[PDB]
């Protein structure tokens, strides 16, 4: 049946090439050329993690015959309270090596060995605020012992962690902020989410200026609210046998907050 | 009967001429020509052992009318905790000589004797991490005193064992990495298994995106998982009177991983 397959995509996640993502990708290209360590900051659900993943994918590992892969961009997200051993494990496993049993000293030396030769040139640490205060020293040592641009990604929660160590603060001072959208950029984004993401059976014409108040009141300009609303409404509409997102559905979803 | 004949075939093993096999063979040919010692490292079930077997079969012993055979490539897998006498016994029996009862010194001198005259150019030691640490000295002496390219094969556990002895580490510094399959290479490998390995009466259409999705999730790029899933799925399918693998049987197998 048709409806269950639409639900199976609408409960999924997708990537939309917003201009915010483009702007980050030009910036990360400049940092990767300069090997410039830096940070990406901005409120929750602003699209940072999805923009970072899109950068990983477009700069995927290149295979070379019988060599370790060339992996220009390594993306990791630490587990909470990430120590040095946890950091080294995530980096080495990302490069498709297996960690052996060993000391932190073994893990460090093995990680530095494979950060070389795999030709890593950027390290993106998402949820960089999950790093333990002692493991930033190893992150800093990677940044300056190798020609690697380390990009710390977090919310303003990260800046509190950063400013608690002036050696971290002074290495990651350069920054880019993901902001909330508004106005015509929000209108174009809302238009994109109808006509590119949902691709629903019958249009709702989400350029409409009045219902844009309903979105704004729930969405506050968070993309990660906007993308949530429409999938909730569309699944309900297609569950209810409505070929469009009706106002009665959008406002009911937007009322759950 | 048809069924038991097909089951007896699928139960077995075979060698598929994957590109990573050819890559290793050309590299081993270079190392053998130069008599350079080296190591082969890669994740478990990535195909290292089959590729090393395929090499020594392409370079099997040559008879010369009542001389001992010219045997340019020796392949051994040591048993666990292989001591020096075990190692010498492995090598001697490969060259078609019987080990007479004697001391380790007698075994060493006899092995050194028959590595000459058989004209051994390359010695491949698979599961080289099973060697006792004292046994590496005798492996180094074979590389040093005879002009023999010794190739250590193992997983990342070998790379840790080797780094516990600078004299071994510094001799086997050159390496080849065996990788997992992914992407287009994995899609071609699935196509080859359907055509060249399983050889069912009817096309299983394993190139299909829905089939690749199942296979990619369960195989994770390990050629060992790919082989042992598809053979078992074919055996299950034939046992049910199906003339091909189907999604339901394939999912039923893949669910066990």
């Amino acid at each position: 049946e048709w409806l269950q397959a639409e639900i199976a995509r609408l409960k999924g996640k997708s990537i939309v090439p917003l201009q915010q993502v483009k702007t980050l990708h030009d910036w990360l290209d400049g940092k990767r050329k300069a090997r410039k360590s830096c940070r990406v900051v901005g409120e929750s659900r602003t699209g940072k993690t999805v923009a970072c993943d899109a950068y990983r994918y477009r700069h995927k590992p290149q295979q070379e015959a019988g060599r370790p892969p060339t992996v220009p961009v390594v993306y990791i997200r630490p587990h909470q309270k990430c120590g040095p051993k946890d950091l080294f494990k995530k980096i080495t496993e990302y490069l498709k090596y297996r960690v052996t049993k060993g000391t932190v000293s073994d893990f460090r030396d093995r990680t530095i060995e494979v950060l070389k030769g795999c030709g890593v040139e950027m390290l993106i640490i998402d949820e960089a605020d999950r790093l333990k205060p002692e493991t930033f020293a190893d992150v800093r040592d990677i940044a300056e012992d190798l020609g690697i641009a380390v990009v710390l990604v977090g919310t303003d929660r990260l800046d509190a962690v950063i400013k608690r160590d002036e050696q971290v603060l002074e290495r990651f001072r350069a920054h880019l902020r993901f902001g909330k959208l508004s106005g015509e950029d929000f209108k174009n984004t809302v238009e994109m989410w109808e006509q590119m993401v949902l691709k629903l059976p019958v249009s709702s014409n989400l350029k409409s200026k009045e219902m844009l108040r309903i979105l704004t009141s729930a969405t506050e300009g968070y993309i990660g609210r906007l993308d949530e609303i429409l999938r909730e409404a569309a699944i309900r509409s297609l569950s209810r046998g409505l070929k469009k997102i009706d106002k009665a559905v959008l406002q009911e979803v937007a009322k759950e907050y | 009967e048809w069924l038991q004949a097909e089951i007896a075939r699928l139960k077995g093993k075979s060698i598929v001429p994957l590109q990573q096999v050819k890559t290793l063979h050309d590299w081993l040919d270079g190392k053998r020509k130069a008599r350079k010692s080296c190591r082969v490292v890669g994740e478990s079930r990535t195909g290292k052992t089959v590729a090393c077997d395929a090499y020594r079969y392409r370079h099997k012993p040559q008879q010369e009318a009542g001389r001992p055979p010219t045997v340019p490539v020796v392949y051994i897998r040591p048993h666990q905790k292989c001591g020096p006498k075990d190692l010498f016994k492995k090598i001697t029996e490969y060259l078609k000589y019987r080990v007479t009862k004697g001391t380790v010194s007698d075994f060493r001198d006899r092995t050194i004797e028959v590595l000459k005259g058989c004209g051994v150019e390359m010695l491949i030691i698979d599961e080289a991490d099973r060697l006792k640490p004292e046994t590496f000295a005798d492996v180094r002496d074979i590389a040093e005193d005879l002009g023999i390219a010794v190739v250590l094969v193992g997983t990342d556990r070998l790379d840790a064992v080797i780094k516990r002895d600078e004299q071994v580490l510094e001799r086997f510094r050159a390496h080849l990495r065996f990788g997992k399959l992914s992407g287009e290479d994995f899609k071609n490998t699935v196509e080859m298994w359907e055509q060249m390995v399983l050889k069912l009466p009817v096309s299983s259409n394993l190139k299909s995106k829905e089939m690749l999705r199942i296979l990619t999730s369960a195989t994770e790029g390990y050629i060992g998982r790919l082989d042992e899933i598809l053979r078992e799925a074919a055996i299950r399918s034939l046992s049910r009177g199906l003339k091909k693998i189907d999604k339901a049987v394939l999912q039923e197998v893949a669910k066990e991983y």
Binding site: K13, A54, K60, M196 | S182, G183, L212, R213
Partner: peptide, 13 residues
């Protein structure tokens, strides 16, 4: 254009 995390897992992976 839009992409699926599951496609990207195969395609780039």
């Amino acid at each position: 254009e839009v992409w699926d995390y599951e496609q990207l897992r195969e395609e780039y992976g």
